[PDB]
Amino acid sequence: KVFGRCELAAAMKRHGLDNYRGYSLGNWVCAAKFESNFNTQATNRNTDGSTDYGILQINSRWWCNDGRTPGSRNLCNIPCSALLSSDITASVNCAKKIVSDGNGMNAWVAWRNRCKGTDVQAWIRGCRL
Ligand SMILES: [Cl-]
Ligand SMILES: [Cl-]
Ligand SMILES: [Cl-]
Ligand SMILES: [Yb+3]
Ligand SMILES: [Yb+3]
Ligand SMILES: [Yb+3]
């Protein structure tokens, strides 16, 4: 599923990401934009041989199981394919764990490089919430 900007903001809010670990909704929407372009089906191979899955590009080395990533820990206890669903519950649940790991949203390098410190409120501008 390719979400609209405000549609995803609404879905993230409904699943409790708004201000989760202190990160406003716009931070999460901005992260999703640059990680997946709001596309739940996004997958991208990493240089270490792991793969990133879903709207928040969650990796198969630490977080989900894809069956092809040596060293897999599957800390979210989910198949990586569940992170591709039109329902974002699995991605959200796992992102809550990731952002709690100690470095906050810096765990998403695209967030650090492209969202951190910017006017992230712009991402939810005009949305009914
Ligand atoms: Cl957009
Ligand atoms: Cl915001
Ligand atoms: Cl933090
Ligand atoms: Yb990546
Ligand atoms: Yb860690
Ligand atoms: Yb409201």
UniProtKB/Swiss-Prot annotation:
The active site is at 35, 52. InterPro entries: Glyco_hydro_22, Glyco_hydro_22_CS, Glyco_hydro_22_lys, Lysozyme-like_dom_sf. It comes from the Eukaryota. It is an enzyme of class 3 (hydrolase). GO terms for biological process: cell wall macromolecule catabolic process; defense response to bacterium; defense response to Gram-negative bacterium; defense response to Gram-positive bacterium; killing of cells of another organism. It catalyses: Hydrolysis of (1->4)-beta-linkages between N-acetylmuramic acid and N-acetyl-D-glucosamine residues in a peptidoglycan and between N-acetyl-D-glucosamine residues in chitodextrins. Substrate binds at residue 101. Lysozyme C is capable of both hydrolysis and transglycosylation; it also shows a slight esterase activity. It acts rapidly on both peptide-substituted and unsubstituted peptidoglycan, and slowly on chitin oligosaccharides. Monomer. Belongs to the glycosyl hydrolase 22 family. This is Lysozyme C. It comes from Gallus gallus (Chicken).
